[PDB]
Design a protein around this ligand. Structure first.
Ligand SMILES: Cc1cc2nc3c(=O)[nH]c(=O)nc-3n(C[C@H](O)[C@H](O)[C@H](O)COP(=O)(O)OP(=O)(O)OC[C@H]3O[C@@H](n4cnc5c(N)ncnc54)[C@H](O)[C@@H]3O)c2cc1C
Ligand SMILES: Cc1cc2nc3c(=O)[nH]c(=O)nc-3n(C[C@H](O)[C@H](O)[C@H](O)COP(=O)(O)OP(=O)(O)OC[C@H]3O[C@@H](n4cnc5c(N)ncnc54)[C@H](O)[C@@H]3O)c2cc1C
Ligand SMILES: C=Nc1c(Cl)c(N)c2c3c(cc(C(N)=O)nc13)C(=O)N2C
Ligand SMILES: C=Nc1c(Cl)c(N)c2c3c(cc(C(N)=O)nc13)C(=O)N2C
Ligand SMILES: [Zn+2]
Ligand SMILES: [Zn+2]
Lengths: 230, 230
């Protein structure tokens, strides 16, 4: 209160552990009196491919298709596909953007990758001045709530997978910071499938409890040192 | 020769710089007598979303959908969608897989993220146990050939983007090495948009030239120390 939150959710199954983390976020933020919107990307059959269909009307150069240039011009001329502009409205209005997803290949599922590719366009999220602290989404907060197959011990600097912070870099720094977001500390729910039930309840409840005081958090220093240093 | 190469290519425009790097690879590897296949993902309209359409038979659990579980079972039973098995045959036969793509948000374009998510399934590319140095694609080589908006100076340890090798981690380590590939050093062609005609022609030629001796190369040590230092 008065704050708006967008949850960008990427799981196919409403009964999943990610579906439960998304639902308790809706439940707890709704309870606080926040304005909440969820983009359920699989239920929306969200298009992930960056293609010339993302521009309506006639292309800026139909000889040689340059996705970046075309979408930048289309944004300035109010000529983006409506699925993209609908997401952009939700982002524009949000004070916090939560991403809820299972880790796929040390990153987001392709459907969520395609949201970041197509929704966060030049002119909207950043300019070619435009970027990192000069990024156009400055003022806004973002938070990654990720679930994994591998265990917390696997995600240590000398475990098989490396530190979890190592995989966060392209998402927190190259994506969210580049657009100007301030980044809250990630919520990482390790290996729910091997946890009990229980520890799974622990995990869901810890996320609900964290969201009680989410507005009181300061963002992380989204630097190479935070991700890789000591 | 004496070798089969699959190039997984992700760019919308045949006249692009990525297009030229993909064609020079086909030209040089063809000239050497190698067998060469190209998966041009935007031309194939390749499906990036991981959904229940990727399984055609009876689901293991039809009331709660688990993508990993159902694709692993479908692989074993031969009930995966045929686009996924078509790609797996190309990978099965390849000695070397080159990914040619523009960097999107410090990672691969979503259409290529979807290829990784859907093609490299459990049972085909890894099993649990059977990952990293015991991954199922052991004995194959992989190479990321990436282009960027950002300059080489931006992609240094003290530059705004961080060192280039930091964004390579989820791809080379979390994906390729997890599946048992040995990873050749990446080809990064920085900032072709800003380079002159001569400097772009130079970058194309440096890749053709590198490919002349590609079979003599050793892989990188795909470790946290190679990516992050210390
Ligand atoms: C393409 C692909 C790539 C992947 N790449 C990686 C990777 O790089 N690194 C990695 O570590 N892992 C990877 N994984 C594994 C993936 O990250 C995990 O499978 C996923 O994070 C598990 O979350 P989920 O919501 O699907 O769990 P679910 O299987 O849905 O949940 C686990 C259990 O929790 C239960 N549950 C649901 N709600 C509740 C609740 N409210 N309270 C208590 N229990 C509950 C469920 O019923 C279920 O029994 C990959 C998976 C795929 C398919
Ligand atoms: C969604 C999105 C996300 C991005 N995220 C990032 C990111 O995180 N970090 C980043 O650094 N960049 C990012 N970029 C920028 C992107 O990586 C670059 O635009 C892309 O790498 C440039 O390659 P290209 O093949 O498209 O260049 P092109 O625009 O096709 O090439 C530049 C020039 O080369 C010319 N050319 C083609 N072939 C030849 C040849 N044989 N000889 C000489 N000239 C030739 C072309 O005609 C053109 O003038 C992003 C872009 C998009 C659209
Ligand atoms: C990396 N790919 C993975 C895929 Cl594709 C997958 N289906 C899976 C995992 C797990 C752990 C790790 C991991 N890296 O710890 N990685 C993966 C896991 O439990 N499952 C079920
Ligand atoms: C990060 N996203 C980017 C987008 Cl989406 C994009 N369209 C673009 C860049 C460039 C550089 C960098 C960068 N990080 O150096 N990042 C990006 C660039 O020249 N173009 C055209
Ligand atoms: Zn940062
Ligand atoms: Zn590795």
């Amino acid at each position: 209160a008065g704050k708006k939150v967008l949850i960008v959710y990427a799981h196919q199954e409403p009964k999943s552990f990610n579906g439960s983390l998304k639902n308790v976020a809706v439940d707890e933020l709704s309870r606080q009196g926040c304005t909440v919107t969820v983009s359920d990307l699989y239920a929306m059959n969200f298009e992930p491919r960056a293609t010339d269909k993302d521009i309506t009307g006639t292309l800026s150069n139909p000889e040689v298709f340059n996705y970046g240039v075309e979408t930048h011009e289309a944004y300035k001329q109010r000529s983006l596909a409506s699925d993209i502009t609908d997401e952009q409205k939700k982002v524009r209005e949000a004070d916090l953007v939560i991403f809820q997803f299972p880790l796929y290949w040390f990153s987001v599922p392709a459907i969520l990758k395609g949201w970041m590719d197509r929704v966060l366009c030049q002119g909207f999220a950043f300019d070619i001045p435009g970027f990192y602290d000069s990024g156009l989404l400055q003022g806004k907060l973002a938070l990654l709530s990720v679930t994994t197959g591998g265990t917390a011990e696997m995600y240590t600097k000398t475990g098989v997978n490396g530190d979890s912070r190592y995989f966060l870099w392209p998402l927190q720094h190259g994506t969210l910071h580049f657009c100007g977001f301030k980044v809250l500390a990630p919520q990482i729910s390790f290996a729910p499938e091997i946890a009990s039930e229980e520890e799974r309840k622990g995990m869901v409840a810890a996320w609900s409890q964290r969201l009680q005081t989410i507005w009181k958090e300061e963002p992380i220093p989204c630097t190479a040192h935070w991700h890789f240093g000591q």
